[PDB]
Design a protein around this nucleic acid. Structure first.
Lengths: 192, 288, 1011
DNA sequence: GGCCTATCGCGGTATGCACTTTTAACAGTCACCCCCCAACTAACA
DNA sequence: TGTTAGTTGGGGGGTGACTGTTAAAAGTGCATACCTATGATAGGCC
């Protein structure tokens, strides 16, 4: 139920066609080389390729663009109003997902201290490995039960380390947020 | 201007119009007038150019019957906000009084028939003036549902007959005239279209009256000012009422575009807004 | 745990490495926008922002060309003011890389940074010797470059390190005007007796402080003269709701303003221009208060979107100027300077030598603070659209008006299609309108620039310094051609404008006060039942098929509003003394700045005002008060002065009865031509005659002396036309000569011929040719052909003639104008010669693609602004308001040709008025001017007439036509190609009409010349 | 030169043209990121 | 006081980037066209 998936797609251009046909050969002759280097050498091959040879791929691309014109015309004229609305919705939603992924991944690329670890996080980190359970979920529930059965005295070290990580996060937050002020990105500072 | 100079066209027209009193606009050389008289019509010629009057009168003297020739420019009758100071310009009340035409109720049948050709460069002006007169129940339409047959250019014809089916030519005059009259093509002369405009008996309603048509014209001009925008966008600038609620009342969605609205959709919109009961005011109309 | 902590530490260090890697890796509208942005960033001290945008533009191939040396100089001056030597050097690097050439402003910026940073004498010396090798002048820096006193001080500090014996030119010795007609005005040879104010120095300082506070606040709160009755519950509820709604709009507007500033700021972080710094020019609280004020004052019917944008732009610019002077110390220097200036006007203070206010003002200093150039028009338009759209989007209100879940915008823009091209309009919500109507707010708000000043205005020292102490005011009102006329006012020699500046300062220095009794009566009628018969508007209760009733209702509402504002301001100024600063149009005619309340208003307005300083009647004061009374009544227009005085003595009983019981007595005054002015004059005459010594009664009422058809007077003087001089009372006579009666007669014979021919308009105008009709008609054709401002007034005057068929009133007015033109040209053939000469000359001058320019006999350059066809449009998401740039392509030959003669006459009557004022000031007279009327105290009417006639004879005694002809010849007959058009133009200019026999000196003996 | 025609803050909207930025077009591998399990909590509203 | 989301750790699985060029789509600055509506003289065109 996705109109976008059935929409006729643009034909491959000349260079992209040359690469699409050469890549399997270069991969057959260099099975262990990284795709990066194969695409690079294929681009150099294209640059060295005589213009008369590129012209063939260009003509093929032009005919494919004519048939694409016919297909996209009939398709667009064939779409009902509801299909146009669902296509617009899929387009907008896809764009929003792109923005969200780019922004979150960006925020991860920026080197910032991870938020403070709680005493419970510390306990899970110290006792998870030795906690019995067939899966991480069962071992985490086990750690949860043993944590709920812990006394206040058995927790003193974990709470102390939690506080120390609180101060660590505070300081590193000051320094990093300052460094972001230098980069002119005061939006990442704590709000109030 | 435009003048009928072909005898064959004059005869064909004569048979069409004969298909009552006939008012012929700008007969000029009088070929159509002579064709009508030979066909047996009772003709009053409203000639804008006095130079054409003698010959026509002579032709009338040939018949020496009920033909009547008046020096009158039909397209200048009853000037809006005018002092009534011109010989060719006249009052339809006085003209009809001299011709013995009596007013009939709107629901009554067609009392009189007017035929002619739009000015070659005043088609829009004439259509607008006649629209004002029709919706205001003034001028000739004070006497009833006058049938008006006029030659018009192809461009203004297509624009007049356009609708959401042909969005590029859909316009305010299309809405006004398609709501006002049942327009039918009677003949096409290469291109000029002879259009028949008969006012609809059911044009005026309890909420659309000769007293509030101006607000509807304001709504139409306002909406077609930005034809690509959404209807709700314009409604938010026209009434304090809930625009989404109104659009839902007329069965249109929020994303409905102006060019997709049918004339009856416009009319039902206006009547729906006028129908609202519990508000001190329904419209925001305040213009000189 | 050391394992996990150490892992986090290692990841953090690697992240630091990643951070190191990341650190390793011809004017134009757009040019006007960028330059205005850079100059704007200096006032907000946002130098890193402007430098960022400039660097981005420089680094791009296609953008580098858009930059200009002036912009580099702007950023350079910013860094010099901040002392960023490295960044300034970087900017110099950009300048050199872009090629082009550095200038005086660049070297001044470098010197500023070196002085501020205290660079070594080796670097300063090396800079001065590189400047000497480049050929630039050391002294041209302080003179040709616009710098603040701080830039001058720092540059001087830098220069004094290498050249310690470097002195600026000795200043400032001011030069005196040597004009033929101003010579005896500025010459020290003569006994001057300049008048002084009745207020002491400390009083003038208190008033100056009050005016300064008012202008600093930018708002004036006046108590309404309305709201006599009030509902107990309705007004209370509506007031509570309105206050809550205003708090909500205040908060919403603050948030919206901050969000908008943030958006524009990010737009500057991107490579796009935005008005961010302009919004950072004024305090956010001031912006919100301004928007809320505009919302409170928005008319119920709405206001043009473009117009509102313009108003917001002007108030923004004004408040920014006021803030800049506030924070730059200009306010303190103005306080000291003005406090020293007040010695010339104060009664209890003397000056070393007598001089004019402008002369003394320039003598004390005169730093004149600093002049700020306005923003480019595209910036004003875009800013206006920003503030307007922000207000509309931010202001919301519930639709329930009188359980309000739904929210609708308070402001909604709708479209008017009356003009074939639709124009965007901003209309307030009707529920909001009814809310404000029920609230019946008891206070009105005015701009400080719209009300009279509480202290004597600033003397006009230049075309950019005048009127209100802080707010900038243009010397010439004319908006069309403002660039041309302003630039020529600055181009002409400074002395040339001395006369006009001193005249406007004189008019502004006139002390005014309110007539308490007249205000009480006019309010009594207004507060209760209006009196349209006496020019008092009636409340909507008296409004009267439906279309006509609505029309009359709207007109009555408009007049009611105008009277409300005028009378409200009059009530506010009841117990205060105030001054009205004056301005000029492109013709030179003077007009008061405060439009609502001023002496140029209607009869009521003229009666509400009187001189604050009085003058003992003396031997003829009472007689002049009676003659003035009769003149105001209009009953003895044709009678001589002695018979007017005798008539006053006859109706003396009705004068006293009218004064004592205006609304309960015989009400004789209501029958006068000017009822309120007549009543005021009756009160003054009563106080005079009932005083112990009438000759010693200190009279405050101004007396008027008007020139009947002053334009025809000027034409008769130019051509020495004896028939004209007799017609318009230039030739002495014992009875007044009424040109309107003779012209009405000749027009009557023409009307007899045309009516004999069977014409309809001539037949219907039979018996309607009257003095008033032909007075206003001739006053129209002389003062203006076309541009039917006066023509509309004539149409009104005919519409008030009940017995006239209103269908021809338009055609009847046109026919009357044509017949007055023909008749005046028949009986005054010489006048026709002069008029046709000037008209044709202007036709040929404009036909060559050049506007008509001349110089008045007082040295004032006049230029006709009529041009057409300049347009460009912005687009804010989306109305597209157009704009008329100041760049013009072709002149409008028709408006120029029809406009030259009447405009020249305007310059002549304006020059005459100015001479009269200047010479009357030397004798200590109080002089003000309303159109053609000259006003003075009853004690000095004779002296004022003497000065009037002397200055008229002196003015027209010069070869005005000859000097004008030679002027147009030199200015417009110099083009080397083509020479044919210059030969025909010279041929027409040298065809000066020969003057008549009339002896101009006779004006000195004409009693009724001005009466 | 002679004769005919237009005239006494032009309006906002939306369309073609010259330029420049963005992206959809082909693909194999390696690193990521999501989710779950529950709990805790610094931060934001 | 109530809502979010980022850690504590692992394991399985879906998914963007890196290598490359082509050109179709799409965002700027500017000139243009439309919609409609009402008796003398000067300019523009032939």
């Amino acid at each position: 139920s996705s109109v976008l998936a059935s929409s006729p797609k643009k034909p491959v251009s000349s260079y992209l066609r040359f690469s699409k046909e050469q890549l399997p050969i270069f991969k057959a002759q260099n099975p262990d080389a990284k795709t990066t280097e194969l695409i690079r050498r294929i681009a150099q091959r294209w640059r060295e390729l005589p213009d008369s040879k590129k012209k063939i791929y260009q003509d093929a691309y032009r005919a494919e663009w004519q048939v694409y014109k016919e297909e996209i015309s009939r398709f667009k004229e064939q779409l009902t109003p509801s299909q146009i609305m669902s296509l617009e919705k899929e387009i907008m939603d896809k764009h929003l997902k792109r923005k969200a992924m780019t922004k979150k991944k960006e925020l991860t690329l920026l080197g910032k201290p991870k938020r403070p670890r709680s005493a419970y996080n510390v306990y899970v980190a110290e006792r998870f490995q030795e906690a019995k359970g067939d899966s991480p979920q069962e071992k985490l529930k086990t750690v949860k039960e043993n944590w709920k059965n812990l006394s206040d005295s058995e927790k003193e070290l974990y709470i102390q380390h939690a506080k120390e990580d609180e101060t660590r996060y505070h300081n590193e937050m000051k320094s990093w947020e300052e460094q972001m002020i230098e980069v002119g990105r005061k939006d990442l500072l704590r709000r109030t | 201007k435009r003048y009928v100079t072909d005898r064959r066209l004059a005869e064909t027209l004569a048979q069409i119009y004969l298909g009552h009193l006939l008012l012929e606009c700008n007969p000029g050389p009088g070929i159509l007038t002579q064709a009508l008289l030979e066909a047996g019509a009772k003709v009053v010629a409203l000639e804008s150019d006095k130079t054409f009057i003698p010959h026509l009168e002579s032709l009338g003297k040939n018949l020496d019957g009920k033909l009547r020739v008046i020096h009158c420019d039909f397209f200048k009758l009853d000037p809006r906000s005018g002092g009534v100071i011109k010989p060719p310009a006249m009052s339809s009340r006085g003209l009809f009084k001299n011709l013995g035409i009596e007013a009939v109720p709107w629901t009554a049948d067609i009392p009189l028939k007017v035929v002619g050709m739009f000015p070659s460069r005043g088609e829009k002006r004439a259509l607008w003036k006649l629209a004002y007169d029709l919706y205001s129940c003034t001028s000739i339409y004070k006497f009833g549902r006058i049938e008006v047959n006029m030659f018009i250019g192809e461009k203004e014809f297509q624009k007049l007959m356009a609708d959401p089916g042909n969005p590029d030519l859909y316009h305010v005059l299309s809405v006004i005239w398609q709501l006002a009259c049942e327009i039918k093509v009677l003949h096409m002369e290469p291109k000029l279209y002879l259009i028949q405009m008969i006012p609809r008996q059911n044009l005026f309603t309890k909420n659309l009256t000769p007293m509030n048509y101006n607000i509807f014209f304001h709504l139409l001009k306002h909406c077609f000012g930005r034809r690509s925008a959404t209807v709700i966008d314009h409604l938010r600038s026209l009434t304090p009422l809930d625009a989404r609620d109104i659009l839902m009342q007329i069965g249109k969605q929020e994303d409905e575009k102006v060019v997709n609205m049918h004339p009856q959709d416009f009319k039902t919109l206006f009547e729906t807004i006028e129908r609202s009961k519990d508000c001190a005011y329904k419209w925001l109309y305040d213009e000189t | 745990w050391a394992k996990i902590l150490e892992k986090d530490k290692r990841t953090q260090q690697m992240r630091m490495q990643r951070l190191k890697a990341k650190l390793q890796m011809q004017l134009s509208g757009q040019q006007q926008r960028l330059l205005a942005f850079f100059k704007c960033c200096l006032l907000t001290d946002q130098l890193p922002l402007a430098h960022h945008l400039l660097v981005v533009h420089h680094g791009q191939r296609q953008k580098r060309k858009l930059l200009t040396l002036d912009m580099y100089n702007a950023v350079m001056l910013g860094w010099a003011r901040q002392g960023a030597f490295k960044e300034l050097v970087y900017v110099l690097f950009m300048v050199k890389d872009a090629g082009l050439t550095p200038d005086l402003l660049s070297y001044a910026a470098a010197l500023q940074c070196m002085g501020r940073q205290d660079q070594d004498a080796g670097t300063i010396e090396r800079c001065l010797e590189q400047m000497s090798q480049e050929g630039l002048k050391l002294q041209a820096l302080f003179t040709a470059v616009l710098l603040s006193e701080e830039d001058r001080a720092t540059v001087l500090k830098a220069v004094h390190k290498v050249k310690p014996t470097f002195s600026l030119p000795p200043q400032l010795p001011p030069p005196v005007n040597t004009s033929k007609l101003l010579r005896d005005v500025y010459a020290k040879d003569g006994r001057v007796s300049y008048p002084k104010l009745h207020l002491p120095l400390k009083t003038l300082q208190c008033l100056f402080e009050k005016q300064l506070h008012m202008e600093l606040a930018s708002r004036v709160c006046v108590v309404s003269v309305e709201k006599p009755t009030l509902p107990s519950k309705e007004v209370k509820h509506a007031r509570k709701t309105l206050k809550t709604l205003r708090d909500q709009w205040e908060k919403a507007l603050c948030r919206a303003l901050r969000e908008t500033k943030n958006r524009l700021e990010r737009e500057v972080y991107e490579g796009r221009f935005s008005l961010y710094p302009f919004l950072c020019l004024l305090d956010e609280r001031e912006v919100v208060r301004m928007l809320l004020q505009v919302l409170q004052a928005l008319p119920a019917q709405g206001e043009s979107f473009t117009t509102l944008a313009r108003e917001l732009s002007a108030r923004t610019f004004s408040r920014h100027v006021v803030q800049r002077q506030r924070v730059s110390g200009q306010v303190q220097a103005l306080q000291n300077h003005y406090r020293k200036y007040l010695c010339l006007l104060a009664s209890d203070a003397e000056v070393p030598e007598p001089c004019l206010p402008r002369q003394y003002w320039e003598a004390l200093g005169a730093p004149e603070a600093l002049r700020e150039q306005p923003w480019p028009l595209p910036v004003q338009m875009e800013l206006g659209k920003l503030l307007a759209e922000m207000l509309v989007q931010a202001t919301q209100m519930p639709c329930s008006l009188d359980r309000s879940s739904r929210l609708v915008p308070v402001l909604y823009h709708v479209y008017s299609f009356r003009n074939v091209q639709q124009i965007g309009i901003l209309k307030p919500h009707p529920a909001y309108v009814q809310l404000l109507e029920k609230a019946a707010e008891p206070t009105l708000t005015f701009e400080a620039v719209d009300v009279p000043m509480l202290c004597p205005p600033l003397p006009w020292t230049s075309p950019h310094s005048g009127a209100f102490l802080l707010s900038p005011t243009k010397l010439m009102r004319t908006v069309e051609g403002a660039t041309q006329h302003q630039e020529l006012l600055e181009t002409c020699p400074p002395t040339a404008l001395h006369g006009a500046l001193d005249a406007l300062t004189q008019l502004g220095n006139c002390a005014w006060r309110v007539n308490g009794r007249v205000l009480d009566l006019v309010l009594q009628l207004f507060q209760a039942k209006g009196c349209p018969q006496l020019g008092v508007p009636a409340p909507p209760s008296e409004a009267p098929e439906l279309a006509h009733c609505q029309k009359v209702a709207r007109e009555m509402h408009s007049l009611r509003a105008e009277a409300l504002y005028r009378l409200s301001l009059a009530q506010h100024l009841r117990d205060r003394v105030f001054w009205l600063p004056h301005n000029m149009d492109f013709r030179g005619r003077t007009y008061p700045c405060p439009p609502h309340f001023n002496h140029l208003g209607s009869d009521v307005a003229r009666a509400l005002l009187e001189f604050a300083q009085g003058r003992p009647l003396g031997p003829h004061g009472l007689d002049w008060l009676k003659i003035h009374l009769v003149n105001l009544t209009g009953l003895k227009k044709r009678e001589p002065l002695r018979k007017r005085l005798a008539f006053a003595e006859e109706v003396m009983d009705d004068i006293l009865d009218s004064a004592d019981q205006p609304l309960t007595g015989r009400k004789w005054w209501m029958g006068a031509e000017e009822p309120w002015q007549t009543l005021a004059c009756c009160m003054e005459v009563a106080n005079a005659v009932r005083a112990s010594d009438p000759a010693a009664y200190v009279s405050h009422l101004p007396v008027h002396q008007d020139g009947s058809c002053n334009g025809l007077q000027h034409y008769a003087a130019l051509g020495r036309d004896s028939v004209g001089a007799a017609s318009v009372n230039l030739e002495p006579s014992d009875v007044p000569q009424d040109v309107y009666s003779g012209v009405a007669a000749q027009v009557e014979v023409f009307r007899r011929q045309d009516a004999q021919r069977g014409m309809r308009v001539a037949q219907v105008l039979e018996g309607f040719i009257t003095r008033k009709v032909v007075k206003q008609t001739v006053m129209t054709v002389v003062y203006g052909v076309t541009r039917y401002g006066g023509r509309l007034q004539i149409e009104k005057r005919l519409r008030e003639l009940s017995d006239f068929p209103q269908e021809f009133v338009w055609e009847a007015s046109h026919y009357l104008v044509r017949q007055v033109f023909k008749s005046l040209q028949e009986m005054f053939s010489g006048t026709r010669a002069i008029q046709h000469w000037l008209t044709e000359s202007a036709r040929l001058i404009s036909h060559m693609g050049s506007v008509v320019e001349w110089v008045t006999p007082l040295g004032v350059p006049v230029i006709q602004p009529y041009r057409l066809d300049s347009k460009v449009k912005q687009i804010g998401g989306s109305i597209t308001y157009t704009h008329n740039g100041d760049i013009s392509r072709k002149p409008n030959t028709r408006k120029q040709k029809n406009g030259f003669p009447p405009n020249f006459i305007h310059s002549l009557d304006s020059s005459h008025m100015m001479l009269t004022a200047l010479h009357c000031y030397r004798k200590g007279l109080t002089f003000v001017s309303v159109h053609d009327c000259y006003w003075t105290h009853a004690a000095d009417v004779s002296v004022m007439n003497q000065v009037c006639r002397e200055q008229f004879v002196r003015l027209h005694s010069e070869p005005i036509l000859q000097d004008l002809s030679r002027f147009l010849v030199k200015r417009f007959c110099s083009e080397p190609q083509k020479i044919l058009e210059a030969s025909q133009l010279k041929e027409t200019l040298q065809a000066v009409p020969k003057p008549g026999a009339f002896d101009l000196e006779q004006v000195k003996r004409s009693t009724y010349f001005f009466s």
